[PDB]
Amino acid sequence: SRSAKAGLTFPVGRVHRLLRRGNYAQRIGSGAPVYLTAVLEYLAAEILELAGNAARDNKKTRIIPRHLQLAIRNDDELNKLLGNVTIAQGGVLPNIHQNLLP
């Protein structure tokens, strides 16, 4: 493959063309054009582990968007990154106030 230089496996060719021509830096001079794919592999692996754990539980084997919404709201680093996003095909965090409650 063209990605196994440092444990990566995502496609490189089109990614090499895009990162080299990212239109944001004049030249990536020594230089980590593959670090975008590195963080991409990192996120893919963490999503793999989380989704496997979620699907394997609930006595099922599939990921319902409810589970992914719960996982997205679960993390704190993702909340600090972009905390102004919501997940569709699910529901809001359940809530009842003790003052609302009888």
């Binding site: 919501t86 569709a88 809001v92 359940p94 809530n95 106030h97 003052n99 609302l100 409650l101 009888p102």
Partner: protein, 97 residues
Amino acid sequence: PHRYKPGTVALREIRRFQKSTELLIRKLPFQRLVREIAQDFKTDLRFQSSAIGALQESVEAYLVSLFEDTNLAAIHAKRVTIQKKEIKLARRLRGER
């Protein structure tokens, strides 16, 4: 007539409505409101297929977050349920304009 105390049966309503992926918004007229909004000024949209679901879920996010902020401001006051003044508190502090 097994009529029990309201608030606890409202509590079981909350429990049922806050458990699964159920679409609590009986809201194709929400889609018609979106259509009236979109065709209010322009025309010939020619959009995607499931985009209505995404925009409606964004509407749900905004409105429901407003709901929880309003309930927090309401229990902040001496009134548990949703009050318009609590919603004004929840929206003005957000920088509504």
